[PDB]
Design a binder for these strands. Sequence first.
RNA 1: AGGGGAUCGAAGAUGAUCAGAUACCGUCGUAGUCUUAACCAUAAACUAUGCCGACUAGGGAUCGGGUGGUGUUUUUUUAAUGACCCACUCGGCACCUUACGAGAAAUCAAAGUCUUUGGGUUCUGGGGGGAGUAUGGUCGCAAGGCUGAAACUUAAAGGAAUUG
Lengths: 121, 206, 96, 25, 129, 81, 87, 97, 216
Amino acid sequence: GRVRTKTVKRASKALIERYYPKLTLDFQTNKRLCDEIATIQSKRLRNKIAGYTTHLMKRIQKGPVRGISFKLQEEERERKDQYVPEVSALDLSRLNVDNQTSDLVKSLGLKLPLSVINVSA
Amino acid sequence: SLPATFDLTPEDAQLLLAANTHLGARNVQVHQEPYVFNARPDGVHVINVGKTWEKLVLAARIIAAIPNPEDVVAISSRTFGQRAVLKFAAHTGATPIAGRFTPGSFTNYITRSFKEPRLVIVTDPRSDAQAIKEASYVNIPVIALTDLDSPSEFVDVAIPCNNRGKHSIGLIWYLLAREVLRLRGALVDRTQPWSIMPDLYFYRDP
Amino acid sequence: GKGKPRGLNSARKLRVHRRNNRWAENNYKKRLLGTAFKSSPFGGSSHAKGIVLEKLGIESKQPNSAIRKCVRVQLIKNGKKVTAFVPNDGCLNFVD
Amino acid sequence: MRAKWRKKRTRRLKRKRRKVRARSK
Amino acid sequence: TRSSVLADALNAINNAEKTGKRQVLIRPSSKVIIKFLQVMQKHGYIGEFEYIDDHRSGKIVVQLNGRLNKCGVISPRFNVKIGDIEKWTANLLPARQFGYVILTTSAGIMDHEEARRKHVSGKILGFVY
Amino acid sequence: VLVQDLLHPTAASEARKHKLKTLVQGPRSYFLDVKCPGCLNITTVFSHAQTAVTCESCSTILCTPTGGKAKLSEGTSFRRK
Amino acid sequence: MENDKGQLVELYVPRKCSATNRIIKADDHASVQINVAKVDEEGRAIPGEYVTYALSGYVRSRGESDDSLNRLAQNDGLLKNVWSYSR
Amino acid sequence: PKKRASNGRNKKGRGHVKPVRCVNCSKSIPKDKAIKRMAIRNIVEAAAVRDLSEASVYPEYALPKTYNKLHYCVSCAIHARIVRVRSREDRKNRAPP
Amino acid sequence: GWVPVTKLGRLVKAGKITTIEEIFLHSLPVKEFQIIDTLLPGLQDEVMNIKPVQKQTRAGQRTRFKAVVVVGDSNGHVGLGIKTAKEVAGAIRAGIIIAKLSVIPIRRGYWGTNLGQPHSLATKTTGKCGSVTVRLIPAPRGSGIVASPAVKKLLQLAGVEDVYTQSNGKTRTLENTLKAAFVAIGNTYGFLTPNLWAEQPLPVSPLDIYSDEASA
RNA sequence: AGGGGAUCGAAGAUGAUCAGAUACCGUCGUAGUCUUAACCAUAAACUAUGCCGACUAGGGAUCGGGUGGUGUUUUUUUAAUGACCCACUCGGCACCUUACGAGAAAUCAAAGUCUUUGGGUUCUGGGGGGAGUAUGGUCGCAAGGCUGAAACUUAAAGGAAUUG
Ligand SMILES: [Mg+2]
Ligand SMILES: [Mg+2]
Ligand SMILES: [Mg+2]
Ligand SMILES: [Mg+2]
Ligand SMILES: [Mg+2]
Ligand SMILES: [Mg+2]
Ligand SMILES: [Mg+2]
Ligand SMILES: [Mg+2]
Ligand SMILES: [Mg+2]
Ligand SMILES: [Mg+2]
Ligand SMILES: [Mg+2]
Ligand SMILES: [Mg+2]
Ligand SMILES: [Mg+2]
Ligand SMILES: [Mg+2]
């Protein structure tokens, strides 16, 4: 079986976690920079790591990946996180509330507009 | 007591009723919850948003009593509250824990997720039961956003809300952070509406 | 109510119940039935004199392989036959 | 042995003893 | 069936105190229950209580502080002499410094210290501490 | 609950409770002043009557018994008393 | 408690729960001590000025800590209509 | 020790339940303790229905079903790849799949 | 070097907490035995019994040893630790650690007539672990500890001069006897008495006073 | 003891299987299985949990009764009903979750409120065997039931859980 071990997978995850604006979908140059940027004792393990990094970069080119996080991805995430509409959907567009809710408001003693509708069983 | 400026304003009531925080659970009802107001037909129970606001301000005072804000912890294993707790941690100190809790975070002094807080805030005590259970081992209080059918055990201040809802949770977190900042002194104007919108702390499927 | 009666006039029940449940014991039963005086080749005595009839090489129980050098004894007062053990190395040679 | 069958054996024995005693009684 | 109402009363008080409640309802409110609770009150173990007069036998609503660990009943009401008081107190109180064995004497219901002072003995009802 | 007033409960709860299990037990039943058509001669009728009550003026019929509350006849007017 | 001549003994006079007046043991790790901040004249909190409430593991476990704290706060004035004595 | 709180069956408040017979081994078993299943099956197959419809007069017809309620004893049900055996915790699972 | 990782450890190393009485008062949980070794430097260990416990395996019986250790200074504090390990020495070491972690206070008191320097317990107390119930009854001066050797040694290390004991169950299970006695002497500060009816002002905790000398 | 007597079927006969198989499997098949009038009085007759009474945690469903609701439907749009829905309640058969508590544990809303030992009351047990035996009484047509030892022997039997 061609199942990779956690040494290979962790090494590839780290290489992607801190060398993404770099190595590409090509096993050859990914290998030729893996031996440049990491200390690996054996060519076989180097090539396995390079292959798994190439596979993960192919995965990344189509959507994100669970367990991975690089600076570009983090910046995209926070940028999408600060999104806000300009309308603030809670803001009034016309508010409906049942008779019990109208009674609640009357109990609290508050001035509010209400589009009362009856709640039927 | 309070100077009566803290009472429920019609703006906050508009927000709370637009987010439908006042819509409690169905006929199910934990007898530890007297926060009900005149059950609706359809079997849905309505909540005293006034009591909600009062308990919320109480929780805010408890939080602001903490000297080191990083010693406050916000929990949410639900997806509808992760953005809320993260933005809460952005505006306050409030060391957040969104997603998984990692059992052994308040015990097990060696693990990397080891917090030793003075207060933990929880979005749903049923989905976040590991956290309250581990807080009952190490002398930590627990604030919780409860519905009317939540398990009240090992729960201190309970804010009645609609935790089934997407907007309600984020609104409660938003109001909580606002009151905390006001009591701390960042928001010097109690009457000002705090430019940050409430829909910032809201879940998005994308 | 834990079974037993607690009432302030319920002592006879407790007494006779104790009598029966005392018969359920072993020492009380042997003491009151008089088994020592009626059985038990002695007469409830500490010691007894007897006349040797035969020497015996009783084999031990398991797990143990040995022969225990006992004797048969007819008691003087009762006439009962009894097996007795001669405890020491070589002391059977004094009991001819 | 099974207690039911031990009981059955004991009963057959009690019966045979009843009759071998009725021989003399 | 129901034999001692004092026993039911003190069982209810004990369970309320074990559960942390600050009040309990006693039915059906005998005189000896009243005097017993009055002793416990004079020594500071329960607090106020209120007799509700239904026309049958009565109810009692007791207020409870947290000072009570066990209020108990001794059934049968044994006849107790002046040294048997000491024997009992040893058997069924936690210490020689606090706790009260309660006994109905011809000079009313009282605790055993008051009974030693008045030099009279009687029948044992229960205990409290 | 661990703290509550058992001497001054809510009327809602006391009406929700069983009649014997209230603070002071008492009847949930009542009496009615009943008018039959024609002969005014109002009759006092118990809600849980157990009898086929009829007016002394004539044997019309006022209430038929049931397992609980009596069923007052169709043409009749009653006044809670 | 004390000996014949004052001179307090009994190290560690212990804490009592604000709800049940029961002692909080040393090995009771479900006990909590809530501190509620005070406010003064603007809405801002005073540092180091707390209202303290101790709660024991038993009350905290039976799920009554919320109600107990509600009533304690309403009695100490920092709350309002939330709690009712008649249930 | 005790294995089940129902002990094997569904007899709370009865005393006696009037046995039935197992469909395979004819063993007498109480009806509450029995396993009941209901084997509802189309008469022919899902395979031969095409041939039947093609060779059938009266189109649209129905192809009705067969209904029988099966009672198995414990032994037969365990042998026939039914209620097989479960862990101490999942024994309490009272629902079907 | 210790290098504590705990708020309490940092405070104890900085010297803000000079007494375990604060720890007991605020019910703080201990997780580093160096705290107890710093605050209570004068306590002594004692090893009660070493029993072997066996686990059946494919290849014979795998054996490890269970050690019971009682630590105590003879003024008011005891701890009990039970540890299993492949080697007796390590069992004893880790048991001493767990015992220090498991330290509790003891409410000593008087049989009567509060003359001086309490010698006994204040109340009748019981503890149960397994079938064993251990009951401690207060005794007068000179009675000494009327108990079996193990419970006697635990109570000596606790500082109880005079106490009676009633016991019930299979007292030959020493782990359960010692745990029952430990629960019993821990319940002493659980029992409420009239001399503790007075209300106190609920002090403030060091974890809130010395907040910056804590984590960072 | 009469009746009845289809079915299944202790006995029994047979065909196999088997080293043997007077057992399991198969085919027959008496007594019995049903009933009337009497007897017997036993069972893992079990919830292996005595009856009465009080208190103590939550949750929902269900059987029976009752109350209320401008509630839904059917009737004669309509009424009263009846059947359903919602809320509540008394009384039951039970069930889910937790353990404050209990327990050796398995587990238990009772097996809890029990060394902080007493609500009332009946029955039974005191290591295992011998032994529910022998004997004597008593009941029974009998089968048997109820009551019920001793000699002698023995350091373990046994319960619940654990890893193999
Ligand atoms: Mg009497
Ligand atoms: Mg041997
Ligand atoms: Mg088995
Ligand atoms: Mg039966
Ligand atoms: Mg013993
Ligand atoms: Mg029998
Ligand atoms: Mg039986
Ligand atoms: Mg009962
Ligand atoms: Mg009903
Ligand atoms: Mg019901
Ligand atoms: Mg029923
Ligand atoms: Mg014995
Ligand atoms: Mg025996
Ligand atoms: Mg077994």
